Amino acid sequence: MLDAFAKVVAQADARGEFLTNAQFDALSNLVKEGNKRLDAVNRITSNASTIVANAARALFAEQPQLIQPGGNAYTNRRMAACLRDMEIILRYVTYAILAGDSSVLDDRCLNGLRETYQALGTPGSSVAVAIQKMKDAAIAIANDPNGITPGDCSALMSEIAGYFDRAAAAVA
């Protein structure tokens, strides 16, 4: 996998070129902005259970047929799996936030996920909703003004949203 730094190095290595002044500045801004990034991971992480539980409450509220007998989330073991999937996807997202690059997420989680769910007959569309619900939950928690030093984290939140949206797309 890659982090924001390695990504740029990788893009650079392949043109055989040193980093442009632009690039150096980009990474420095990332570094500068690093406390925010760290807070965001810490916060989403520390509430992972909650994010997952409440998005699942939500999804099943909106999509009851999943828990109608026969539904892809009927039976406790399928329910567990679903919840587990949601925690998995949340967990790889935190990784990507921490890295500033989607590659961990991509490679170790999104790759060939659509096909897996298709095989299983898990409705990808529904997964993608569960993902969206966590996103909105996690953004809110991450971006909570309380208990934190005031500053603008909006660019970070967009990045974060990016990874969640990216995951939702990989399975819709």
Added chain:
Amino acid sequence: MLDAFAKVVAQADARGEFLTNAQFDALSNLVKEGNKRLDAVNRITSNASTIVANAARALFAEQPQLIQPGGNAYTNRRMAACLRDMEIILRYVTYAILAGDSSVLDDRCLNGLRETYQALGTPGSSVAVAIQKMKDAAIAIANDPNGITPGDCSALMSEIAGYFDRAAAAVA
């Protein structure tokens, strides 16, 4: 895998419903009729060698080209494999009889067998004959009036024939 009972439970679980009185009656008749089922498995089992040997004698008599040099049953090791295959298929059939459900057979034996033989260039049609010959042998042995308490096992024999025919189809 599933047995006749689990099958019905599985069909029921997925409609989210209890068993209808019909269903209870069905399984009870199965249970009632259980000595026959047990005799059938015991008998076919106890003669497995014979069934296999004589069906193989038969098939090769009808299909000599299999044992013409070059034939898919020429050489002792291919012959052995063939015989082994026949015993395998016979063995998974007994399982299905004992369970009253084809699932063991299906899942652990028929699945993707056609494709295997195709790969190998074993003529599926010929396997399916070997299967048919064992069926007729095994029915006869199972349904022998001698050495057993008289009663009608004809419904059981049809079930049995079912599994054999099912296997023959999976490779023709």
Added chain:
Amino acid sequence: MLDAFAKVVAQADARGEFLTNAQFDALSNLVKEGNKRLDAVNRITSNASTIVANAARALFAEQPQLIQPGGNAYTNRRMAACLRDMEIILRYVTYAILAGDSSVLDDRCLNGLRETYQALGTPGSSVAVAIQKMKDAAIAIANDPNGITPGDCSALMSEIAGYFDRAAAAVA
């Protein structure tokens, strides 16, 4: 795998036939000619490093883009792999020479190599050149009149060329 002898046995076994007088004569000529075969393997073997190094010098001289940054042989680890591939292919060729049959080469090396390189985005055409360059090097070394007892090895060299060409085709 097969050697020249086993090949003929295999071709024979499947027609269910003994060896024709022709066949016996063929293998005897092979045996007769065996010192040459042995010299050829010994010689190519003993210079494997050289063959590989010089063909690689050559290829990259002719195809610099491979070592332009981004090129499929840029970075030392990809370069190593390439060199390794060349030694691999050379090594399976010696095997085939020693056996008088391409099967070892075929089965354990050429099989599905095109597809591998395609996956990787290694240009098969370029591999096939590297192969050709080794061929010409190895023929020269094998067929060196110095330090060896004079005799005609030209039929052997054609065989050898065969295996190299065969490998080049399997990836162009």
Added chain:
Amino acid sequence: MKTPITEAIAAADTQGRFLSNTELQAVDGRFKRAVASMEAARALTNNAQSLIDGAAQAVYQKFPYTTTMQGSQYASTPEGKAKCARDIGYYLRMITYCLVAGGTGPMDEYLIAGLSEINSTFDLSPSWYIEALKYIKANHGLTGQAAVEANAYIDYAINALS
């Protein structure tokens, strides 16, 4: 799925042999038992509606707050009262499935697997469900081996919840 019969076939199959006599003897064994556990099952099936309703109330009684308490996990709301009725229904249905199959297989597969995880995630306390079980155990109204077989599958469930 795990039944006496599949367990036997599984043994033979993993050893690549035909069924043994002991295996055959086991299935016979199962058939002998099927009689009672089947009449228990259809008993439970026939006055289940009774039993379910009865069960809920009995939980409600034992744990009053479930009638009133801010919470989607609570049967305060009528939505939740449904959910709970449904959950109880699910539990009953499973003990019948077990009686029918002649083992815990169906309950193991459709209910016990993931039960911890689900109860946790959804703020569903096990006590709620253990009461409901004790209730059904009392009033299934079974006597004889039929009650034995039923109470067996029930206690199994009660364990899982503790």
Added chain:
Amino acid sequence: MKTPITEAIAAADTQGRFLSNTELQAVDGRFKRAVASMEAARALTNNAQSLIDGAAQAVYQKFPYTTTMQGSQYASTPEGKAKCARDIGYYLRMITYCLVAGGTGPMDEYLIAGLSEINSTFDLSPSWYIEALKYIKANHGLTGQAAVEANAYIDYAINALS
């Protein structure tokens, strides 16, 4: 298939190395031997029809019933007499294949593998085939290393049958 040469290549290959000198020395070794075992092979090939026929009768003699006995496994019938002629033919053909390859490889692969299973399944007693082998061993009419090489592959076969 297992020959001296493939055995060598196999060693190198499983160690991922080029052929060694000892490996080369082995093949040379094989080439030195090929001469005799090849003239044995074509000897056996040239009066095989003799040898086969001769062999059958010799078995028939030793085991009279095979001429007469209800049984598809028996050369009582003329169909069976064929089968048996054929079987013997197969055995001879293999020792030649071995002589040609310079090891038991072809007989290991085309005959020995599954031999137990087949003899068993088809009520084919090994004695029948061991007699036929002793017969061929006597009258191949070979002397010298050529006979050595031949009788070697034959005894190998006789073992397998016991």
Added chain:
Amino acid sequence: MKTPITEAIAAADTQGRFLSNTELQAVDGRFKRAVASMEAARALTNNAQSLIDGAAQAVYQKFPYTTTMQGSQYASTPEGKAKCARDIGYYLRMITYCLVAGGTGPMDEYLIAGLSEINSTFDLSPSWYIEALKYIKANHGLTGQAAVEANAYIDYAINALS
């Protein structure tokens, strides 16, 4: 690729857990260091042409024959002088990549892996490259933690060559 951050994510991931606090603490750690190693990197990037040229000559000096000697591996020819200029360029570029990533990852992946094999195969003596490295180490013109960070990645390279 191996950076401080990916190393952390890797630990969590192989244990299937969310990131720990110590992991977070590590990345913070990395961010604190990024400042200096980044200004080293762009320093080195800005007078690299200087440094490369300077480096080559310095090798040439130390090993005169490279200017003159039948050999494609030698910078005798002008073709080779290029190759060598290029090689040096590659080495410098990598220490910057390391400074940027905050570890040896990029040099490990783009240069160290296969370095033995390549130097061997192409008659490229390590001394050539170790001199060039000592040269750059002298004149990068860095002071402070920035020089620390740079010389660290350089020494790492020098090791690999011995």
